[model samples]
Target: NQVAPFYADHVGSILRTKGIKDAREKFQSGEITALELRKIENTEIKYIVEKQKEVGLKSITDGEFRRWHFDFLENLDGVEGYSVKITGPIDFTTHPFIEDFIFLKEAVGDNHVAKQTIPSPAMLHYRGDIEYQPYLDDAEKFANDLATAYQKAIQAFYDAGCRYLQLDDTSWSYLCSDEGFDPETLQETYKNLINEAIKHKPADMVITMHICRGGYGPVAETLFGKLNIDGFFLEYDNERFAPLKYVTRPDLKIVLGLITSKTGEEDEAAIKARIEEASEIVPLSQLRLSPQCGFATEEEQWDKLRYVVRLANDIWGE
Candidate 1:
């Protein structure tokens, strides 16, 4: 029933190409204009989108070529890294990420799903705080405002023809890592923020999440049982597969990130076997396959991605 979390998905980024890296440096150094830098980014993005399709991915992204994971947050009216404040009701009205989506939409065409990944609204609270004059003493108001702004952002993406959106967040992992923050408080607040932000999602739009799971641990119940996400890209390893018991929802598709992105090694037989094992808990029809992390733009990845495609075809070949 879901269009995303495809059998051979990869995490959002493809790492920075040398061309984009050098172009950004030159743009910042004044040796190149904004247009020139964008041209480089576009060309590189186009290149990788093709690579993704060539590898048989069901969804295509811009490789996150434009920004780092959390860079898009600064596009809001009153945000600067951590010092968030409000001059007016914060709405992510106009963001380059949307324009980037338009470019991705055009590049991806109608052949495959074009998806955009943005940091979860919980990320704002994770790194920084809301100290705006109007909402200075009001935490819930600020939380609601953050959620509303993201709702506006999700709508803008929908209007721009995006149907698949992924929220990349580290808060889930951190919340359960026994950090200074109390799990109950952090879990409730983060959950509410995400639930509220995505409540207005269009019927046709698919919004999944990637929580950087090396394995599902202590917070499994809260993350799997509670969130309103459509699915999760849970990075997999031998030690982590057992805890997937927390994922109790039948409709929640889980993309198993079993292939390695950090090394050239993979065991096709081993991975295929693990997929069968995971299917004991999650239905085979509701599962997908992907790399453990985003790619690093190396020659080695081409074969690895092809492996992802081939192995999927072997297991679930039509």
Candidate 2:
């Protein structure tokens, strides 16, 4: 359904290899200015957008062109005391996803059917294994703030003619695993944030989400763990999404990440079987498909990406 060629080629590598320090040095030291970076990015985005339009991609992103990595659920709108720190050597994690967040507003001036992405609010709330405690302490407040910011963001995008806004969340599925998070309470919290974020989004805006089970190099997987995909097949993990499950909004679509973006050896029958099972849980009219994660994780981005399109096409044909 997506149209643009993922230019993770340049973007992901830049973020990883250069890290944020060099980016900041280049900007602050005048080797490169924020405006210059924007110009370069805008041109790249424009080219990608043109190519996607030519090929007829129904869902289009800026190819994540404006982001260094997907890292902006906490740094925006002046919520102080929170800063992005790289957990390791990955350049994408070392800095804010987009150094010049403003550039997105200007570059994406409502030119087409654009779908923007960011880390899910829950991901932001739980930074990681080490830093999750601080976030958990202020979870409710953060959720409220995050929801308000999203509302404003959605409204602004709508003002500029955007109709689709999708959030990539990886935290909810972990709750399904008994060893991971408490499913009962986590579901309530998740619904609260999502509902608040979509509170004032336009009725016509196709607000959607893609749940991640964790994206790794080869053989990354989910915790379906005998959860009776048949019973909860059409049933969502929570009640808040009931309306969406039924396709109440015909234009609104959810891309179920049934196919793993990891190793692609899960077999066509297994993939189709899950899809068929899902149809029993919910109407097939609204379902779409994609990988469980993006093509590249920190370990092996490029190689996996080469196959994603072909794999997606193969699955699409089926």
Candidate 3:
């Protein structure tokens, strides 16, 4: 109810502002100075922070206006180029988000958590075809090395004062439908690597994972019960995979995606009922509320975010 894993939360990125969006493009093309672009971005970040506070979210983010979802991986110790192809052993040294994270921290001042979201370690292993030279196809060796890098990376982020960190991923979504390897083996591979990566995480640092599955389909039990993270941001705005019966642990929390950012409309009554229904399967206290995903539509989010907090405040009375 306090700090992170808030009852009223969001899936990181919010709708971008055209004013700030244009500045970055201009800065990249030499139309504006880096300082000028940064100033404009700073203004936009401040605006979004205020909007989040206005909506009453206890956790705050920078609206992810700086870069793409997985772009930050380029800053890893062993990666380069825009079209990133890891040219060497995958190990983490530092992250670009470190120093600049202060912008978000300062903007969020007192009584709120400054959340920093980045792509999960599983992301580097998934998605694209990585030329796993040397250890080529030696899955165990590569996962072991990569997991070591991730532990150090989390330490780095923690040292930088990132108390609430999220590993945003879509790899599970990949397994839900298709997998190059039989998913049974791939499933164990992912779980071990992820859990191993965070094995040394500080108790005070809250780490959560957000799986980008549009519908739960039939992956709930395997997902909610298996992952060793503190909480999950799973979609429940629509249906598919399975029900919430698999959410067996009382220690883990759920930020239910009961609202959608794709559109500006929702059945308010329908959402309230959905939350009540989910609580029957998993205690009402364990469930939180958020948009199904980031705001790809960009501008359709503010109203939805406000609606989320309003509903949470009324339902849970926080």
Candidate 4:
């Protein structure tokens, strides 16, 4: 009953508008105070939220308007001092997102729910040991601290009225690339980190993970199948992802990205047929449609997303 993509959704993040870009520049130049910059951000978020509502998207994101996708993670304590290593304990401060999520809650329509997207716990860990040598020296402590940090993050978002939280961790796909390393150990470590983070999530709160670049198949299952995540946002618009039959898990929802987010063009028949083929492996009730990824470039992002919403509504009869 808690399954999702209930109708349609998108991998969060959208192209940054010129207004947001300008505000950042002004803030950097000391022309605008932090309070003033926040006002501009709130205004733009309100406009974007309304646009998403007009297009009929049930899950709305702030377009990551307040911060850079990965850079924002640096705000966590202990992350600033560590170079490339995943050493030391990471803790939350004001948790910049709490205010943003609150603003989105107030901006969205009655039927729409707000989504908060952030980098995964493992993401910061893997980058460790590079900049700092000690990260290569220890494993147990790093995993413990990372888990605690993200656990706090989950609770913070839930308190801010975020029922849907998406963790954008591209490292999961990166591991699927080769057979060079001990994937079993790596997978186990990541599974533990993720499981620990969401272990105490409120029953009403739903947590999902999104991976970019490609698919992991059954090999992917060993890692994700053990976690408590409710769903997965996978990149399958092109052939980069293998056949769907290889990847299946008990009680897991799969968001199939059939449309391309790069341009606004799509073939209704071709996409529908692909979904039909995928339905054989994944039950229709568990399958949902979306673009492969978010549009980072300024060109056609809005145009592309609008098309996805309209097409999904037509196909699903929503």
Q: Top TM-score: which candidate number?
A: 1
- Per-prediction TM-score to the true structure, in the order listed: 0.92, 0.58, 0.91, 0.88
lDDT of 3 by residue, 38-72 (tens): 88888998998988888788888887887745567
Candidate 3 ranges beyond 4 A from true positions:
33-36, 178-181, 214-218, 238-241, 297-300
- 1 or 2, which is superior by TM-score? 1
The whole-model C-alpha lDDT of candidate 4 against the native structure comes to 0.73
Q: Kindly report which residue stretches of model 2 are placed more than 4 angstroms away from their true locations once superposed.
A: 1-30, 54-56, 68-71, 80-112, 128-143, 178-183, 214-253, 259-270, 297-318
Per-residue CA lDDT of model 2 for 50-165, tens digit only, reads 45444433344556645522345334543323344322211112224333333444444444455556665556445533233444466565567666766666576666565555
Q: What ordering of candidates by lDDT runs from best to worst?
A: 1, 3, 4, 2
Q: What is the lDDT of candidate 1?
A: 0.79
- TM-score result, candidate 4: 0.88
RMSD of 3: 2.3
Query: Lowest-lDDT window of 10 residues in candidate 3?
Result: 236-245
- Candidate 1 vs candidate 2, lDDT winner: 1
Candidate 1 colliding pairs? none
Q: Give the count of colliding residue pairs in each prediction.
A: 0, 4, 6, 5
Query: Per-residue alpha-carbon lDDT of model 4 for 36-146, expressed as tens digits?
Result: 998998888887887777766788889888873456567676666334433345677577778778888888856778888888887887755434345445677667767
Model 2 has an lDDT value of 0.45
Number of the top candidate by lDDT? 1
